[PDB]
C-alpha cells in the first residue's frame, strides 16, 4: 500500500529477487512501480522503511527492506545491503536520508 503500489507488481518483484544475492535496487524499483511514482509517494515509502521514525533508514532497517513489502519476505544478504547503501549514501554517514532515497529512485 503506502506508496500506492499494486500487489501484483509487489508479488512479481519479490519472486524475481527471492534468491539470495539476486536483489538489485533499481531493478526492484522499476519493477514494483516505485521508479515511476510521484515524489510525494517516493516519500511515503521512505518513511515506512524508516521503521523506527528516526528520519533515516539505518543499516538495519535496510536489511529488512523487503519485509516492508511482505512480512514473510527475505532479509537482504550483507552484500546486498552493502551495495544499496553504497549507491544511496552520498555523504558517507552510513544511513540514507529522504533526499538521498528520492535521489536513488530518481523522481
Ligand atoms: Ca530509521
Ligand atoms: Ca547518508
Ligand atoms: Mg532502530
Coordinates of N, CA and C and ligand atoms in Angstrom, one line a residue:
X1 N 0.8 -1.2 0.0 CA 0.0 0.0 0.0 C 0.8 1.3 0.0
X2 N 1.4 1.7 1.1 CA 1.9 3.1 1.5 C 2.1 4.0 0.3
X3 N 2.8 3.5 -0.7 CA 3.4 4.2 -1.9 C 2.5 4.0 -3.1
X4 N 1.3 3.5 -2.8 CA 0.3 3.1 -3.8 C 0.8 2.2 -4.9
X5 N 1.6 1.2 -4.5 CA 2.0 0.1 -5.5 C 0.9 -1.0 -5.5
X6 N 0.8 -1.7 -6.6 CA -0.1 -2.9 -6.6 C 0.6 -4.2 -6.5
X7 N 0.0 -4.9 -5.5 CA 0.2 -6.3 -5.0 C 0.8 -7.2 -6.1
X8 N 0.4 -6.9 -7.3 CA 0.8 -7.8 -8.4 C 2.2 -7.4 -8.8
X9 N 2.4 -6.1 -8.8 CA 3.8 -5.7 -9.1 C 4.7 -6.0 -7.8
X10 N 4.1 -6.0 -6.7 CA 4.8 -6.3 -5.5 C 5.1 -7.8 -5.4
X11 N 4.2 -8.7 -5.8 CA 4.4 -10.1 -5.7 C 5.3 -10.7 -6.8
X12 N 5.2 -10.0 -7.9 CA 6.1 -10.1 -9.1 C 7.6 -10.0 -8.8
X13 N 7.8 -8.8 -8.3 CA 9.2 -8.3 -7.9 C 9.9 -9.3 -7.0
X14 N 9.2 -9.5 -5.9 CA 9.8 -10.3 -4.8 C 10.1 -11.7 -5.4
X15 N 9.3 -12.2 -6.4 CA 9.6 -13.5 -7.0 C 10.9 -13.4 -7.7
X16 N 10.9 -12.3 -8.4 CA 12.1 -12.0 -9.2 C 13.4 -11.9 -8.4
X17 N 13.4 -11.5 -7.1 CA 14.6 -11.5 -6.3 C 14.6 -12.3 -5.0
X18 N 14.0 -13.5 -5.0 CA 13.9 -14.4 -3.9 C 15.2 -15.1 -3.7
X19 N 16.0 -15.2 -4.8 CA 17.3 -15.9 -4.4 C 18.2 -14.9 -3.6
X20 N 19.0 -15.5 -2.8 CA 19.9 -14.7 -2.0 C 21.0 -14.2 -3.0
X21 N 21.2 -12.8 -2.8 CA 22.2 -12.1 -3.7 C 21.7 -12.0 -5.1
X22 N 20.4 -12.2 -5.3 CA 19.8 -11.8 -6.6 C 19.1 -10.4 -6.5
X23 N 19.1 -9.8 -5.3 CA 18.4 -8.5 -5.1 C 19.2 -7.4 -5.8
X24 N 18.5 -6.5 -6.5 CA 19.1 -5.3 -7.1 C 18.2 -4.1 -7.1
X25 N 18.7 -3.1 -6.4 CA 17.8 -1.9 -6.1 C 17.0 -1.3 -7.4
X26 N 17.7 -0.9 -8.4 CA 16.9 -0.1 -9.4 C 15.9 -0.9 -10.2
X27 N 16.3 -2.2 -10.3 CA 15.6 -3.3 -10.9 C 14.3 -3.6 -10.1
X28 N 14.5 -3.6 -8.8 CA 13.2 -3.8 -8.0 C 12.5 -2.4 -7.9
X29 N 13.1 -1.3 -8.0 CA 12.4 0.0 -8.1 C 11.6 0.2 -9.4
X30 N 12.2 -0.3 -10.5 CA 11.4 -0.3 -11.7 C 10.2 -1.2 -11.6
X31 N 10.5 -2.4 -11.2 CA 9.5 -3.5 -11.1 C 8.2 -3.1 -10.3
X32 N 8.5 -2.7 -9.1 CA 7.4 -2.8 -8.1 C 6.7 -1.5 -8.3
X33 N 7.2 -0.6 -9.2 CA 6.4 0.6 -9.5 C 7.1 1.9 -9.1
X34 N 8.1 1.8 -8.3 CA 8.3 3.0 -7.4 C 9.0 4.0 -8.3
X35 N 9.7 3.5 -9.3 CA 10.6 4.5 -10.1 C 9.7 5.3 -11.0
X36 N 8.4 5.0 -11.0 CA 7.5 6.0 -11.8 C 6.3 6.4 -10.9
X37 N 6.6 6.5 -9.6 CA 5.6 7.1 -8.6 C 5.8 8.5 -8.4
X38 N 4.9 9.3 -7.8 CA 5.3 10.7 -7.7 C 6.3 10.9 -6.5
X39 N 6.8 12.1 -6.4 CA 7.8 12.3 -5.4 C 7.2 12.3 -4.0
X40 N 6.0 12.8 -3.9 CA 5.2 12.5 -2.7 C 5.2 11.1 -2.2
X41 N 4.9 10.1 -3.2 CA 4.8 8.7 -2.8 C 6.2 8.2 -2.5
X42 N 7.2 8.7 -3.3 CA 8.6 8.2 -3.1 C 9.1 8.6 -1.6
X43 N 8.5 9.7 -1.2 CA 8.5 9.9 0.3 C 7.5 9.0 1.0
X44 N 6.3 8.6 0.5 CA 5.6 7.9 1.6 C 6.3 6.6 2.0
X45 N 6.9 5.9 1.0 CA 7.7 4.7 1.1 C 8.8 4.9 2.1
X46 N 9.4 6.0 2.0 CA 10.7 6.2 2.7 C 10.4 6.1 4.1
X47 N 9.4 6.7 4.5 CA 9.1 6.8 5.9 C 8.5 5.5 6.4
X48 N 8.4 4.6 5.5 CA 7.8 3.3 6.0 C 9.0 2.4 6.3
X49 N 10.0 2.5 5.5 CA 11.1 1.6 5.7 C 11.9 2.2 6.9
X50 N 11.6 3.5 7.2 CA 12.2 4.1 8.4 C 11.4 3.7 9.5
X51 N 11.6 2.4 9.9 CA 10.7 1.8 10.8 C 10.7 2.5 12.1
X52 N 11.9 2.9 12.5 CA 11.9 3.5 13.8 C 11.7 5.0 13.8
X53 N 11.3 5.6 12.7 CA 11.0 7.1 12.6 C 12.2 8.0 12.9
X54 N 13.3 7.5 12.6 CA 14.5 8.4 13.0 C 14.8 9.5 12.0
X55 N 14.1 9.4 10.8 CA 14.3 10.3 9.7 C 15.3 9.7 8.7
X56 N 15.8 8.5 9.1 CA 16.9 7.9 8.3 C 16.6 6.4 8.3
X57 N 16.9 5.8 7.2 CA 17.0 4.2 7.1 C 18.4 3.8 7.4
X58 N 18.6 3.3 8.6 CA 19.9 2.8 9.2 C 20.3 1.5 8.5
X59 N 21.4 1.0 8.8 CA 21.8 -0.3 8.0 C 20.9 -1.5 8.4
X60 N 20.1 -1.3 9.4 CA 19.4 -2.5 9.9 C 17.9 -2.5 9.5
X61 N 17.4 -1.3 9.2 CA 16.1 -1.2 8.5 C 16.4 -1.4 7.0
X62 N 17.6 -1.3 6.6 CA 17.8 -1.6 5.2 C 17.8 -3.1 4.9
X63 N 18.3 -3.8 5.8 CA 18.3 -5.2 5.5 C 17.0 -5.9 5.7
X64 N 16.1 -5.2 6.2 CA 14.7 -5.7 6.3 C 13.8 -4.9 5.3
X65 N 14.5 -4.3 4.4 CA 13.8 -3.6 3.2 C 12.7 -4.4 2.6
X66 N 12.8 -5.7 2.5 CA 11.9 -6.5 1.7 C 10.6 -6.7 2.6
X67 N 10.9 -6.7 3.8 CA 9.8 -7.2 4.6 C 8.7 -6.2 4.8
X68 N 9.1 -5.0 4.4 CA 8.1 -3.9 4.5 C 7.1 -4.1 3.4
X69 N 7.4 -4.9 2.4 CA 6.5 -5.2 1.3 C 5.9 -6.5 1.6
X70 N 6.8 -7.5 2.0 CA 6.0 -8.7 2.5 C 6.6 -9.3 3.8
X71 N 5.8 -9.4 4.8 CA 6.3 -9.8 6.1 C 7.1 -11.1 6.1
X72 N 6.6 -12.1 5.4 CA 7.4 -13.3 5.3 C 8.7 -13.1 4.5
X73 N 8.8 -12.0 3.8 CA 9.9 -11.9 2.7 C 11.3 -12.1 3.3
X74 N 12.2 -12.3 2.4 CA 13.6 -12.4 3.0 C 14.3 -11.1 3.3
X75 N 15.2 -11.2 4.4 CA 16.2 -10.2 4.7 C 17.0 -10.0 3.4
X76 N 17.7 -8.9 3.2 CA 18.8 -8.8 2.2 C 20.2 -9.4 2.8
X77 N 21.0 -10.0 2.0 CA 22.3 -10.5 2.4 C 23.3 -9.3 2.6
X78 N 24.4 -9.6 3.3 CA 25.2 -8.4 3.7 C 25.8 -7.7 2.5
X79 N 25.9 -8.3 1.4 CA 26.4 -7.7 0.1 C 25.3 -6.9 -0.5
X80 N 24.1 -7.4 -0.3 CA 23.0 -6.7 -1.0 C 22.8 -5.4 -0.3
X81 N 23.0 -5.4 0.9 CA 22.8 -4.2 1.8 C 24.1 -3.3 1.6
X82 N 25.1 -3.9 1.1 CA 26.3 -3.0 1.1 C 26.4 -2.3 -0.2
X83 N 25.7 -2.8 -1.2 CA 25.7 -2.1 -2.5 C 24.7 -1.0 -2.4
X84 N 23.6 -1.3 -1.7 CA 22.5 -0.3 -1.8 C 22.9 1.0 -1.1
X85 N 23.7 0.8 0.0 CA 24.0 1.9 0.8 C 25.1 2.6 0.2
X86 N 25.7 1.8 -0.6 CA 26.8 2.2 -1.5 C 26.3 3.1 -2.6
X87 N 25.1 2.7 -3.0 CA 24.6 3.5 -4.1 C 23.8 4.7 -3.5
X88 N 23.3 4.6 -2.2 CA 22.4 5.6 -1.7 C 23.0 6.8 -0.9
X89 N 24.1 6.4 -0.3 CA 24.5 7.2 0.9 C 25.6 8.2 0.4
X90 N 25.2 9.3 -0.3 CA 26.3 10.0 -0.8 C 27.2 10.8 0.2
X91 N 26.7 11.0 1.4 CA 27.6 11.8 2.4 C 28.3 10.9 3.4
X92 N 28.2 9.6 3.2 CA 29.1 8.7 3.9 C 28.8 8.7 5.3
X93 N 27.5 8.9 5.7 CA 27.2 8.9 7.1 C 26.7 7.5 7.7
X94 N 26.6 6.6 6.7 CA 26.2 5.2 7.0 C 24.7 4.9 6.9
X95 N 23.9 6.0 6.6 CA 22.4 5.7 6.6 C 21.9 6.7 5.6
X96 N 20.7 6.4 5.1 CA 20.1 7.1 3.9 C 19.0 8.1 4.4
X97 N 19.0 9.3 4.0 CA 18.0 10.3 4.4 C 17.0 10.4 3.3
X98 N 16.0 11.2 3.5 CA 15.0 11.2 2.4 C 15.5 11.7 1.1
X99 N 16.3 12.8 1.1 CA 16.8 13.4 -0.1 C 17.7 12.4 -0.8
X100 N 18.5 11.7 -0.1 CA 19.2 10.5 -0.7 C 18.4 9.4 -1.3
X101 N 17.3 8.9 -0.6 CA 16.4 7.9 -1.2 C 15.8 8.3 -2.5
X102 N 15.2 9.5 -2.5 CA 14.5 10.2 -3.6 C 15.4 10.2 -4.8
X103 N 16.6 10.8 -4.4 CA 17.7 10.7 -5.3 C 18.0 9.4 -6.0
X104 N 18.0 8.3 -5.3 CA 18.4 7.0 -5.9 C 17.2 6.4 -6.7
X105 N 16.0 6.9 -6.5 CA 14.8 6.2 -7.3 C 14.7 7.0 -8.6
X106 N 15.1 8.2 -8.4 CA 15.1 9.3 -9.4 C 14.2 10.5 -9.2
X107 N 12.9 10.2 -8.8 CA 11.9 11.1 -9.3 C 10.5 10.9 -8.6
Ligands
LIG1 CA1 15.1 4.6 10.9
LIG2 CA1 23.9 9.3 4.3
LIG3 MG1 16.1 1.3 15.0

